[PDB]
Amino acid sequence: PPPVPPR
Amino acid sequence: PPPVPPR
Amino acid sequence: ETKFVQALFDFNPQESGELAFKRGDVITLINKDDPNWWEGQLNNRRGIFPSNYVCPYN
């Protein structure tokens, strides 16, 4: 799974 | 998986 | 029209307000107010999720 977008 | 479309 | 997005991978929330889901889940899209974090509904639960974890569905 890709990294989670700028939280 | 969805059914494959008519060829 | 009601638009759905489908889950590409499992998403485990790291913060509160985030929507948990498994690959395969069909989420109802509430909005895309943030290009990276979309808000949706999965049955009773609601929250934001990463837009890169889903693909259009309906």
Next chain:
Amino acid sequence: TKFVQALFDFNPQESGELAFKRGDVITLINKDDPNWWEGQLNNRRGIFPSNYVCPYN
């Protein structure tokens, strides 16, 4: 150049159909037919169901 990622594995039933697994990134060659798209995965090339993939960008 456009790409699509497989949402599920696709097992060819007829010759000319491109085999792939969930997550494989396929290069789009043609998508004129709304049902059967043509793509390239490494050195393999063929048609596949559009409802089995989604934009990879």
